[PDB]
Amino acid sequence: KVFGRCELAAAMKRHGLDNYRGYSLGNWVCAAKFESNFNTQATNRNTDGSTDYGILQINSRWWCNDGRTPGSRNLCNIPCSALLSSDITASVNCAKKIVSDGNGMNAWVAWRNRCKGTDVQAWIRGCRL
């Protein structure tokens, strides 16, 4: 599914991401824009031979099992296929686990590059939420 921006903001809000670990909802929508361009099926190989899956481009070396990544740790305890659903639940719950330790939303490099230090409220403006 390729989500619309406000459609995704709504889905993220119902899934409890607004102000999760102190990160306002706009952060999350902006992250998805620059990570997956709002495409739940985005699947991007890395040069270490891992893959990034889904709307938030979660990496198979650490977080999910795709069966093809040596050194794989499956820290979200899910198959990588769950991260490619039109239902964002598995992605959200994994991202909530990610963000609650380590480097926060710096776990999403596109968030660092395009979202951190901007008016992230732009990403939820114009939306009926």
Binding site: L75, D101, N103, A107
Partner: protein, 112 residues
């Protein structure tokens, strides 16, 4: 960024070493912490189990984490690195090259 000091150090057998790490330029709270050692002449990096001779000090306000190593011998020569853990305390040296954690630049230890 995680600032690790000292970068290099020489100690006598029987001394202790304390390495200090501070997480800077971050707007998030300090999470779980990890320590790694690669023994001289060994090539495998390994996690350090905290406790006993290895004493960690964490200060949440200053986002500082330090490790004391007691009772050094030549067997302790090598390189040491601190870093951020993930997923509620999971540590792995490969995190240091990942987008999910930061690590200090290392401490090269020589023990006389």
């Amino acid at each position: 960024r995680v600032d690790q000091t000292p970068r290099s150090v020489t100690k006598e057998t029987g001394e202790s070493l304390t390495i200090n790490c501070v997480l800077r330029d971050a707007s998030y709270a300090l999470g779980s912490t990890c320590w790694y050692r690669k023994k001289s002449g060994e090539g495998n990096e390994e996690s350090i189990s905290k406790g006993g001779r290895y004493v960690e000090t964490v200060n949440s306000g200053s986002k500082s984490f330090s490790l004391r190593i007691n009772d050094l011998t030549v067997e302790d020569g090598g390189t040491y690195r601190c870093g951020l853990g993930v997923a509620g305390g999971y540590c792995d040296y490969a995190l240091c090259s990942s987008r999910y954690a930061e690590c200090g630049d290392g401490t090269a230890v020589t023990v006389n």
